[PDB]
Amino acid sequence: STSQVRQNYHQDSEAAINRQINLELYASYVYLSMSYYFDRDDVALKNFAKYFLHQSHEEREHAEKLMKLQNQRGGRIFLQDIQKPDCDDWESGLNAMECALHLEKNVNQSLLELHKLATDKNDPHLCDFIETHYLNEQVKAIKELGDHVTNLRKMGAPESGLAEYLFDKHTLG
Amino acid sequence: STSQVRQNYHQDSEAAINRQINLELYASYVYLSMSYYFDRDDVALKNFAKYFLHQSHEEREHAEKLMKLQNQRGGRIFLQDIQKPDCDDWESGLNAMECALHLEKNVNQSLLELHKLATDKNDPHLCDFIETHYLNEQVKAIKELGDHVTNLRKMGAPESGLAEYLFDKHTLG
Amino acid sequence: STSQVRQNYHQDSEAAINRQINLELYASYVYLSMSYYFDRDDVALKNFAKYFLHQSHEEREHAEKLMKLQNQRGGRIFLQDIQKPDCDDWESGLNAMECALHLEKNVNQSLLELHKLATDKNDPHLCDFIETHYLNEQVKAIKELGDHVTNLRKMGAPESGLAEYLFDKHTLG
Amino acid sequence: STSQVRQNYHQDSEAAINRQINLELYASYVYLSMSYYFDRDDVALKNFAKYFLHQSHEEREHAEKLMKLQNQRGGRIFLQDIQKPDCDDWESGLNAMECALHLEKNVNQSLLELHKLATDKNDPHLCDFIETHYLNEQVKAIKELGDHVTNLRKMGAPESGLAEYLFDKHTLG
Amino acid sequence: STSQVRQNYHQDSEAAINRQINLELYASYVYLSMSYYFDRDDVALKNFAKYFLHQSHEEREHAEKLMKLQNQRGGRIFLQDIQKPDCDDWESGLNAMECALHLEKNVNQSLLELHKLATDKNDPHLCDFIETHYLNEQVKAIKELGDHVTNLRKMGAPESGLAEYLFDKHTLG
Amino acid sequence: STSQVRQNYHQDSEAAINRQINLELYASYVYLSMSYYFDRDDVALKNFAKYFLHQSHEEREHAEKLMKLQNQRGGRIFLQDIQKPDCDDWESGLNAMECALHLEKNVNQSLLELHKLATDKNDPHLCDFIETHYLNEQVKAIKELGDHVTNLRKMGAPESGLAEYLFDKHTLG
Ligand code: NA
Ligand code: NA
Ligand code: NA
Ligand code: NA
Ligand code: NA
Ligand code: NA
């Protein structure tokens, strides 16, 4: 019943990897919802739409890399429903960037809890996998979203529709 | 409240497009689950894994094209949870191909019901969108999966593990 | 007497690196013996021979990288005899792949014990050297050998000589 | 007052990163002083001058990478005076290489103390940043300077001015 | 004790060159502090950060050219501590440009005092070195910073965060 | 039990080929030990290290060519332990070259005894294999090592560390 490849891979780590797969698929779905909000004819910011669609595809790659890790270590993937995002209408480019920053901090907190579990189960391959492929990516994503929120607030968003239009052209274009 | 672009787009068509978006995202998730089943070390058929991962990414493109249509016609996308697939373990390459054929026939039946609704609401742009981008794609997908099931059964799958290995190398490779 | 470069490098870590050098040279020698078994005229599977000769040369590179680490940290290499492999005749391609999987799991267990010693002696350079250059290589090697054993058993090896011939041509060729 | 990006970044780690920035800027300044000592007309070893000027520019890049890390994690850089180096006249190429080895061991000891603090504050992103970008660089720098000191002493430096001239041409040229 | 190359190089000129080396290293350090202020997530003007980091590296080249001059004329470099800059937080892009203009005028006044000393000691090689490599560079730097301050004030900085964002994109980008 | 390919291949020749395989693997291991001695920070002669590592890899190719010969003639390879080299510390570049000359003369004496056995068992294919692939290689290796020992002794090694440094740069570089 145990996989012939499994070695030093605790059942609690296997279950935490399955929960992280679901959270990465959920973040992919939130960014897909934000992307198509900015494609609506009454919002119409195409480079915001492009930026969040690229983030949706990168979160799906993060989930597929954890599914490959679960099979490489001999664990078994167990998928759950992907809940729908908490908003349908994201209000403004600034509000969506602030929601993305909040989501990325939540994903980063889950990865730090997974690292702590891997360290407590003395699984250095899993600790290094999370440090190499996920933790610096999340620090860079959080710093980029914080810079975007700071620039939109300083330019006068959300009240200034000129600010979001020019940020869409000069920063996200 | 009505979109400034909306013309000849009935609320029942808008709701049926939202249900089809969810079904395409669900099919993407079923094929992602099949792909990583064939990547397990106790199944180990890499070209089956590749074939179903490519199908998962194509179903996500089908869902994003319907989200773009909903915004082009001035409807509003409403997302729902993506339910987890009906199986975790798909048994054999033949059983997964038969499950994919069943899923693609279900998706095709939903598209034929959407076409019938668009014809009854006299929406020729939506009828042509479904004929141009979805109905022939589904007939081709169903005929390719039927050919794969026929070849695997004739070669002696699922009992012959030699049959699935050589089908993985010569048809899916 | 202490090297002028030595810093934060405990004598127990130096001795464990010398034991790991010997185990990597021993694994190189086991794979060289398997390679030339499959080159015999009464076994004659050339791509099995090639696959194990490539593994023998990669294990010698693993040993030379640990010898370079021992000199970079100011430890002193102490070599021991390389024992001959436990078998002369490896029986079949499936039996040799299962023996290789067993050997790679043993090498991985020794590397996990070396990581635990480096963590207990607070030597983060040595922990990171082992995570960066050895632990993911071993997880990938073990998953590839597990996939090869699974495919050979499903195709009907070792009893089916047709199975090993076609695996040699289509997977290892 | 807390940065919007800050997560899992303890104030003691932030202060230790500010001290390491100052030590890397101080090492850049020591190597700049050594470089221009070997450019004097009464010392005149141009490849020693080039080697230490390249080391000065690499230590400034090490300091700027830690300043970028401090902003990526939401800490605040606080700069201090850069003290002048302990020598004006470095005596001979061998004495300067021995002083560089001593300086690089001091920088490495400070990085090992920073790693230990990051491990005690459970900050795996900072532990991995220090292992990935600093600890192996320092082990390589210390082993290269130890090899240079060994070769200059064996060739008869500092008493043999022929030894330093030929080392400048054949090893540093 | 006198260098074999020294000719027509007065001890007061040698000491003034050592003070100018320290001032160029201090200006390099002020611009490095400004650069990383604009890289903070709550300021986030990347092209201001790039512009001041380039100025920091050019001031270090100005210091190294004066160290090369001191050795070419047979004087002896004597380094002093590099004091930390007068600010940690530079407030806004306009305030940092005004501080840079003030710093460059101070550096230019020191170079004009060095030229006057070289003229009073009848050292035409040193007068021409300062005119050729430093005085026109400083007039160009001061005119460029004055143009930047004028444009930022006319666009409405520092109160208009839109002004600094668009200046960062169109003038410094 | 006799191989279907075996013809004119006496059991005493088969056993002598197995002993020569072990001696070539032992010489590979002695040269690997010499290579990493010259990589130590207190010896630090990189081109001596490179020269002996290349010799280690060439002796492993000599052993693998005799394993291929044993299978081509239908004999059975029987491997034995590879004993560790007689020294851990090789003293100086001259002493290691003299030890290599002694080792290569021993390998050549074993090959001349194998040729004499093949001639006494009237096995001209094996005599020609040894003349074509091994005897002139050994005469060239012994003459090159004798030239290296002569040059190092004439330059004043081992007492002159300048001699070994310049031989490492001009002859082995
Ligand atoms: Na992610
Ligand atoms: Na579809
Ligand atoms: Na290995
Ligand atoms: Na450094
Ligand atoms: Na300057
Ligand atoms: Na040989």
Author numbering:
A (entry chain M), B (entry chain F), C (entry chain U), D (entry chain J), E (entry chain A), F (entry chain T): 4 to 176
Verbatim from the authors:
In this manuscript, we have tried to assess the effect of using CDS for cryo-ET STA data collection in combination with the SR mode using a test specimen, apoferritin. Here, we show that a combination of both SR and CDS during data collection has allowed reconstructions of apoferritin to be obtained at a 2.8 Å resolution but this is further improved to better than a 2 Å resolution when processed with SR in SPA, significantly surpassing the Nyquist frequency of the physical pixel size of 1.356 Å (up to 140% of Nyquist), similar to that previously reported by ref.
We went on to collect data sets at 81k EFTEM and 130k EFTEM (approximately the same pixel size as 64k in SR) on the same apoferritin grid. If we treated the data collected at 130k, where the physical pixel size was similar to that of the 64k data in SR (0.677 versus 0.651), then we achieved a slightly higher resolution, but with more particles, of 1.74 Å, which was slightly concerning as we expected to get a higher resolution at this magnification. A potential explanation for this was that this data set was initially collected for accurate pixel calibration and initial detector testing and, as such, the defocus range was not optimised for high-resolution structure determination (the defocus range used was −0.5 to −2 microns). One potential cause of this resolution limit may have been that these data were collected with the beam tilt corrected image/beam shift method, and the beam tilt correction may not have been accurate enough. To test this, images with the equivalent image/beam shift collected from each stage position (49 positions – 9 × 5 matrix) were treated as individual optics groups in Relion, and the beam-tilt was estimated and corrected. With the increased DQE at higher relative spatial frequencies when collecting at higher magnifications, as reflected by the B-factor calculated for 64k of 77.5 Å2 compared to that at 130k of 55.9 Å2, the only potential benefit of collecting at lower magnifications is that fewer images are required. The quality of the density for the water molecules across the multiple reconstructions was good, with the individual water molecules resolved in all structures at a 2.12 Å resolution and better, with the strongest water molecule density visible as a continuous density at 2.7 Å.
